[PDB]
Amino acid sequence: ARALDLLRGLPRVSLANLKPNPGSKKPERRPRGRRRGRKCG
Amino acid sequence: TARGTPSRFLASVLHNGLGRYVQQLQRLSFSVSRDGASSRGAREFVEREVIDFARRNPGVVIYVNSRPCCVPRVVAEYLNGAVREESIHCKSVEEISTLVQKL
Amino acid sequence: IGIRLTLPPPKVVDRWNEKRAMFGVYDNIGILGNFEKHPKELIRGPIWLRGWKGNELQRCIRKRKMVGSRMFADDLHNLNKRIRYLYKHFNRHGKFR
Amino acid sequence: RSRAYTPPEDLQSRLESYVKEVFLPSNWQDISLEDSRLKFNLLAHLADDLGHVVPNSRLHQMCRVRDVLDFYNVPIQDRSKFDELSASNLPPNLKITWSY
Amino acid sequence: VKKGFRAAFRFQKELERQRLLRCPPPPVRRSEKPNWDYHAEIQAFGHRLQENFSLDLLKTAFVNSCYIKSEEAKRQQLKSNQELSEQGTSFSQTCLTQFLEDEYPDMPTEGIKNLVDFLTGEEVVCHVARNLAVEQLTLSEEFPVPPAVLQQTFFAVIGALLQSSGPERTALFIRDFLITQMTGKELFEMWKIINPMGLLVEELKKRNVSAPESRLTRQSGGTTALPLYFVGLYCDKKLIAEGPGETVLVAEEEAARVALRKLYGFTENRRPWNY
Amino acid sequence: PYMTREQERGHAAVRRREAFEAIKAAATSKFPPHRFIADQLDHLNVTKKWS
Amino acid sequence: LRNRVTDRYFRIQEVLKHARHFRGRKNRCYRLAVRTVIRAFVKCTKARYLKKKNMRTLWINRITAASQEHGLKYPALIGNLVKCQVELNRKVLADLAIYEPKTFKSLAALASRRRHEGFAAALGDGKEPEGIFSRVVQYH
Ligand SMILES: [Mg+2]
């Protein structure tokens, strides 16, 4: 694992570094604004 | 819109190109939080490029103030007294080297 | 013009409060305590929704069947009306069928 | 306690004292350190002789006295950023104040 | 009471801006404000003008005499500006007259003396010194720096430059900053004359040319309140000038100036300054 | 016309087939992109500070 | 109300600052001021098409003015400066009418001499030598 040596130079993982996997969280689509809500779908 | 905003004519300061070209930038004043997430790109500008920028323009004196700020700023002062304070909050290194070379 | 003319009193926040410093302890009590307990026997709340998630029609139907015998009378009549409303909403109305 | 470690000019020599005190054959820069007594003793000398510990993240990486030799001939420099910039040739149109 | 900090913080900083549009502060100089370093800003000064000053000599070209008489009166609870603003005023009063005579070898001694009285007077040179950031590098007693002091200080900078690179650099530094100030100006906007028809007769008698005849070349609307005349100035049936005007005595006075601008080589389509 | 219909029969069939086989190989080569340890560990940088 | 909007003073003031110079109640009341700021912003971008058009008919009207002092017309000047391969546009030609009128007397002379060289060429249709100002400089 070369990836663990990359962890040495990075700062420590806190609860302020966390990020879900890209694709795991979809954006919630809510009816405000010109596109999403006029008759709101 | 142009009726809602002022106007002016095309002018240089002191006939800037006739005899010699005088760089109109006088000062640059960065304020970068050391422990602060918004100044993370601007910390690398002070790291990498603020030495390299300070040798392409010797007539501009640069200050890096490095205090507890929440929104890092660059205060560009010109020879005629106009002050442009632009905010480099959460910008990359690339977006600041274009920001500062534009000022 | 509802915006305050003075800035509000400061929010101090104790990050090393006893609740925050020991937050999370025994969340993993099953997988490294020989499974004698589940992590949902740590959750403390209403007796009907311990270790159980549902929408509002599943929640009021479950609250009625578990705790409706000792609910207050004008508070129970609101629950039967609410179940009768959320039945009609969730089963008869909506965009998708 | 300061982390400023400078590799001395004689690290190749002081190590040959320290392999020989942990053992002793030739090709003394390629001993496999798979014994833990032979790894603890060699690395508890080199910390107490030099003031520079092996980190836990690099501890399993050193299986050869080749690999212990080059951990000690790198320098560790531990300074603040104001110390790092002001000792780094600032041009005279550059002022760095540090309100901290 | 809606909770939250950020709108109350924006609104607090946007009421401070309204406190400055109702109660703005009096001007303080750049020295007693944050981000200032005087030995820095004097080095960076010369690099802007592309000139190699010598910093002991440039630093004292900002120490005025009035600054000194406050420091010693405050010391109860330095070399001046004067030596360097004497070599820098006498040089730029003499290096300017050499350029204006080589470019216009037909202007008299009375006009070029008044051209150099304008380029070295207080109102051009304190527009040059204010946009070259001299006003922020001075040491003086008061603020904003009065044009007695700022016209004095800017020539001590030219005085410092003369002893640091000599005339063959300083004849440029006046050509690039004081000579460029006459660009896009008419002649009698600097050298203001009374009765140009008097000044035109004697210049014409000097070149052994006879009298100019005032004469009405073109006109329009002579019985209205918006007339136009063109008064042509004939010197033996050749015109040397003609000028317009609202009435006849305005157009004859202005055609006298049109003649002097052609006589002196200060016309509008004259050859520009070579830089 | 320079040729007739009998002369241009199949005269571009080698390039016309080859052009579609690049349209077909464009369409049958859809996949999710490679996902790296680079873009994941790079989010640890958001708490980078100075000493 | 769990979370309500505190930033609403600053959203009103992005639209009211653009309406400050208006008349009546469309500078103060946001509901009227948002329909006029929108309509002012629609007119501002559709006037980038009419600034360019209205400049050119102003240039054409100033060229028609000055080419009639010299006897020509606008089409006899502009079409004939093309046949002399002189590719000056309308903005510069209106600038020469006002600010350099000895040159506009030269361009009205060049356009008219080429105009006479076209009548005198197309009378004897067939092989006749071109005028001096009728030769094209071909580029290759
Ligand atoms: Mg609507």
Swiss-Prot record, chain C:
Alphabetical keyword list: Mitochondrion, Ribonucleoprotein, Ribosomal protein, Transit peptide
Molecular function GO terms recorded: structural constituent of ribosome
Subcellular location: Mitochondrion
GO biological process, one term: translation
Any one Gene Ontology cellular component term annotated for this protein: mitochondrial large ribosomal subunit
Main location: mitochondrion
Repeat is among the record's keywords: no
Top-level taxonomic group: Eukaryota
Family, as annotated: Belongs to the mitochondrion-specific ribosomal protein mL51 family.
Subunit (UniProt): Component of the mitochondrial large ribosomal subunit (mt-LSU). Mature mammalian 55S mitochondrial ribosomes consist of a small (28S) and a large (39S) subunit. The 28S small subunit contains a 12S ribosomal RNA (12S mt-rRNA) and 30 different proteins. The 39S large subunit contains a 16S rRNA (16S mt-rRNA), a copy of mitochondrial valine transfer RNA (mt-tRNA(Val)), which plays an integral structural role, and 52 different proteins. Interacts with OXA1L.
Protein name as it appears in the record: Large ribosomal subunit protein mL51
Included range, full protein: 32 to 128 of 128
Swiss-Prot record, chain E:
Keyword tags: Disease variant, Endonuclease, Hydrolase, Mitochondrion, Nuclease, Primary mitochondrial disease, Ribonucleoprotein, Ribosomal protein, RNA-binding, Transit peptide
Name of the encoding gene: MRPL44
Disorder cited: Combined oxidative phosphorylation deficiency 16: An autosomal recessive, mitochondrial disorder characterized by hypertrophic cardiomyopathy, liver steatosis, and decreased levels of mitochondrial complexes I and IV in heart and skeletal muscle.
Stored Gene3D superfamilies: 3.30.160.20, Ribonuclease III domain (1.10.1520.10)
InterPro entries membership: dsRBD_dom, Ribosomal_mL44_DSRM_metazoa, RM44_endonuclase, RNase_III_sf
GO biological-process terms attached to the record: mitochondrial translation; mitochondrial translational elongation; RNA processing
Keyword Nuclease among record annotations: yes
Domain DRBM: 195-265
Enzyme class, broadest EC rank: hydrolase
Record's subunit section: Component of the mitochondrial large ribosomal subunit (mt-LSU). Mature mammalian 55S mitochondrial ribosomes consist of a small (28S) and a large (39S) subunit. The 28S small subunit contains a 12S ribosomal RNA (12S mt-rRNA) and 30 different proteins. The 39S large subunit contains a 16S rRNA (16S mt-rRNA), a copy of mitochondrial valine transfer RNA (mt-tRNA(Val)), which plays an integral structural role, and 52 different proteins.
Pfam families xrefs: DSRM_MRPL44, RM44_endonuclase
Gene Ontology CC: one annotated term: nucleus
Record flagged with keyword Nuclease: yes
Gene Ontology terms for molecular function: double-stranded RNA binding; endonuclease activity; RNA binding
SUPFAM superfamilies, A to Z: dsRNA-binding domain-like, RNase III domain-like
Source species, domain of life: Eukaryota
Domain RNase III: 56-187
EC number(s) on file: 3.1.26.-
From Swiss-Prot, chain F:
UniProt record, GO biological process: mitochondrial translation
Domain of life the protein comes from: Eukaryota
Principal place of residence: mitochondrion
Organism for this UniProt entry: Homo sapiens
Gene this chain is encoded by: MRPL57
GO molecular function, one term: structural constituent of ribosome
Any one cellular-component term (Gene Ontology): mitochondrial inner membrane
Family: Belongs to the mitochondrion-specific ribosomal protein mL63 family.
Subcellular location: Mitochondrion
Keywords: Mitochondrion, Ribonucleoprotein, Ribosomal protein
Parent-record interval covered: 52 to 102 of 102
Assembly mode: Component of the mitochondrial large ribosomal subunit (mt-LSU). Mature mammalian 55S mitochondrial ribosomes consist of a small (28S) and a large (39S) subunit. The 28S small subunit contains a 12S ribosomal RNA (12S mt-rRNA) and 30 different proteins. The 39S large subunit contains a 16S rRNA (16S mt-rRNA), a copy of mitochondrial valine transfer RNA (mt-tRNA(Val)), which plays an integral structural role, and 52 different proteins.
Name of this chain's protein: Large ribosomal subunit protein mL63
Curated annotation (Swiss-Prot), chain G:
GO CC annotation terms, alphabetical: mitochondrial inner membrane; mitochondrial large ribosomal subunit; mitochondrial ribosome; mitochondrion
CDD domains listed in its UniProt record: Ribosomal_L20
GO MF term (any one): structural constituent of ribosome
Presence of the UniProt keyword Mitochondrion in the record: yes
Subcellular location: Mitochondrion
BP GO terms, sorted: mitochondrial translation
Signal sequence, renumbered to the chain: none
Keyword set, alphabetical order: Mitochondrion, Ribonucleoprotein, Ribosomal protein, Transit peptide
Record InterPro entries: Ribosomal_bL20 (IPR005813), Ribosomal_protein_bL20_C (IPR035566)
Major localization class: mitochondrion
Family as reported in the entry's similarity comment: Belongs to the bacterial ribosomal protein bL20 family.
Subunit note: Component of the mitochondrial large ribosomal subunit (mt-LSU). Mature mammalian 55S mitochondrial ribosomes consist of a small (28S) and a large (39S) subunit. The 28S small subunit contains a 12S ribosomal RNA (12S mt-rRNA) and 30 different proteins. The 39S large subunit contains a 16S rRNA (16S mt-rRNA), a copy of mitochondrial valine transfer RNA (mt-tRNA(Val)), which plays an integral structural role, and 52 different proteins. Interacts with OXA1L.
Protein name: Large ribosomal subunit protein bL20m
Source taxonomy: Eukaryota, Metazoa, Chordata, Craniata, Vertebrata
Gene: MRPL20
